Write a protein that binds this DNA or RNA. Sequence first.
RNA 1: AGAGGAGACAAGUCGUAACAUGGUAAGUGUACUGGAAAGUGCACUUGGACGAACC
RNA 2: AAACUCCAGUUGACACAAAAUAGACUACGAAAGUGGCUUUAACAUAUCUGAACACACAAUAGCUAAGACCCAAACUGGGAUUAGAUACCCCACUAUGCUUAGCCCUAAACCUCAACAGUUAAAUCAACAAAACUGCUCGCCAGAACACUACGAGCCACAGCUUAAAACUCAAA
Lengths: 71, 122, 116, 167, 85
Amino acid sequence: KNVLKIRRRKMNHHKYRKLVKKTRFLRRKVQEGRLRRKQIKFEKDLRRIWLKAGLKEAPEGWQTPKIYLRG
Amino acid sequence: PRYELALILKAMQRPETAATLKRTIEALMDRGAIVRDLENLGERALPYRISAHSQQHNRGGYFLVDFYAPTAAVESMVEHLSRDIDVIRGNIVKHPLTQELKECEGIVPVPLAEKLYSTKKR
Amino acid sequence: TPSLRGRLARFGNPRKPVLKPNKPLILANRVGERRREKGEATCITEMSVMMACWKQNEFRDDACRKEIQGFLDCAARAQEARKMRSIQETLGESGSLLPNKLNKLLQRFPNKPYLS
Amino acid sequence: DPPPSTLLKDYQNVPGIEKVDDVVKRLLSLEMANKKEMLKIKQEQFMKKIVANPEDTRSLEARIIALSVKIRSYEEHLEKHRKDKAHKRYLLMSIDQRKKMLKNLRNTNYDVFEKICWGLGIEYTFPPLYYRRAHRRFVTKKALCIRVFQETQKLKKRRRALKAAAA
Amino acid sequence: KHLKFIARTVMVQEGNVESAYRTLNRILTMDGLIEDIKHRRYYEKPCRRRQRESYERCRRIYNMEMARKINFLMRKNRADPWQGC
RNA sequence: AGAGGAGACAAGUCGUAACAUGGUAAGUGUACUGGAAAGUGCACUUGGACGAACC
RNA sequence: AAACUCCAGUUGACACAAAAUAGACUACGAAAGUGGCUUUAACAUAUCUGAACACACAAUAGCUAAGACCCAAACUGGGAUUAGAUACCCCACUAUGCUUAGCCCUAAACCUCAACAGUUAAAUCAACAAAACUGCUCGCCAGAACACUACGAGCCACAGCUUAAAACUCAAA
Ligand SMILES: [Mg+2]
Ligand SMILES: [Mg+2]
Ligand SMILES: [Mg+2]
Ligand SMILES: [Mg+2]
Ligand SMILES: [Mg+2]
Ligand SMILES: [Mg+2]
Ligand SMILES: [Mg+2]
Ligand SMILES: [Mg+2]
Ligand SMILES: [Mg+2]
Ligand SMILES: [Mg+2]
Ligand SMILES: [Mg+2]
Ligand SMILES: [Mg+2]
Ligand SMILES: [Mg+2]
Ligand SMILES: [Mg+2]
Ligand SMILES: [Mg+2]
């Protein structure tokens, strides 16, 4: 068989990689912001969990971990 | 298991060769081996030059030590032979007589392979 | 003859294929043509002797007559041998048979990779 | 492990083996043999200790005992060769096969299954119902939910004292 | 480390250096050394080496079978016994 | 809303990357590099060929 | 041409690199892979299928940290070629290929042909390819392109990998 479909996929992948290389800084900034918002959403969900249960504050000795930070 | 140590010793006079063989067999016994036989293949020119302990050997005395040793002693004996200076080259193998030769009826002929391609007309 | 059992990738063959032919392993009813041998430059040694003698004798033919004659004889022998080689190729004595006669023989007894 | 002086499985049932030279006893001992002879001796000991019929090898109990000996050998091998992925796979697959065999034996013959578990020191554990990834978010939320439940239990316990005192 | 003038050595007979060199080259060719050197001039990647080996094995099988058929049928190259019919 | 992407519209411009051994076989993964198709390294695939007796 | 002439040739000493011939053998492994020698341990399952909701592996490339460095070699530099040559050709060298400890988890990972049991009976059979099938089970597929993409989620991965759309468009692919 010919490689026309493979050639189309090859060009698509090459152009995508070049696009990523061109905008690798704005994408990194957007990813950092998304991770921030993701951690915020997780913390809000945990807060909802302990609020619906009647606790006025977080359980004693509990601090929500930063599970999405690079560290 | 039953091992055979093929030993190439530096070409020396008879007292030195006897002392080296005694030292090697004593080391084997100390590591636990039961030595069964010591066979001399004679002194002969090596097939190729061997450089052992900063010395080039052209001739060597060939010996075999058949023995029964625990599996753990083979590594220690290899280390001991490596440290020895009178041994040009020592290799421990599993005894060839241990592996029994299965009987062979004969060369079974291989017929030409068939039905590899469809019989459709081409 | 090397075995073909379990070599090609086929149904019921568990192992990975050994051979991956680009053409079916089926005998054709013809053989390849009598391939020519690419000609090499000839009489180079005699030419070298003649040219070295020319260099030593300042390209004076009178001194170099013997080597010049040797080179000329080698050249004539090479040309006549090329003609004789063409004649021999037409004859086909060197090979067991010419490709044309072998193709005729294979035509008489063709391969049958099909049923009938 | 069996003592190194232990004779091989084949040679321990020949008459007069106790009257032979100590060298002969050494040669026929587990000391002068590979580890698989020791594994066979271990298997024989386990069969004599556990199964009702020591001479039966096709029974599920015999298969479980042999697989347990193989598993122990694999673990001993991996303790020295910690980067042997092939034997790691063999150990894990043998563990799964032994779990399957123990499930079958427990379904078929429970008393013998208990004898197997006691003799071989196998703690038969029922598989968990759901095999799902416990990623960071899920683990953290599960931990917080457990802590919240404990705090709510404490609050519910404390709520009773005031009502009891008031009444 | 081996001895010299034993391996790949051919003695010349009555100054027939041409025949001695031909014999040496034939020995190297039959043992496959010449092809090995030619292929070792540049590195042959393992996929390329496998492809070449497969092609050469298929070629050997086909050539041996064709030679067998030719030798089998060569007896039938004789004169036509029923000429005219 | 500044922009990016895809498709259509289809021009002009710079090359000719692919289809023949496409003129350096093509492609996959991956890494680096380049105006651009793309180039190169490493391993893999035939969805290439090696001409199919000897010569 | 550039480059080296502390270069080349012989001889001797000489490795943490790679393993002619055997191999016209077709073996081992679940796959990836595995073809120098020795030794040790060792190659699951006395029905079969079965995990993308897990566990363990997974060529090459690549990252991290410490070493080795003959040879090869992205990048880079030089020479050449060319209209240009950011390539093909030549030279030098680095990351890298190797060792150890972790990662990364991707391949035309393809024998593009699932596992098990069975048949060659016929109604054999679109074409080509590596003949046509039956029973059972699991996984996958449902026009092309958008799309090995976006968003969401998970990951030691941060220009990444896995899962993976939709809108606009066409009568094709
Ligand atoms: Mg596109
Ligand atoms: Mg082109
Ligand atoms: Mg090209
Ligand atoms: Mg390429
Ligand atoms: Mg480049
Ligand atoms: Mg299964
Ligand atoms: Mg990997
Ligand atoms: Mg380097
Ligand atoms: Mg170099
Ligand atoms: Mg270069
Ligand atoms: Mg190495
Ligand atoms: Mg592969
Ligand atoms: Mg990809
Ligand atoms: Mg993606
Ligand atoms: Mg995303």
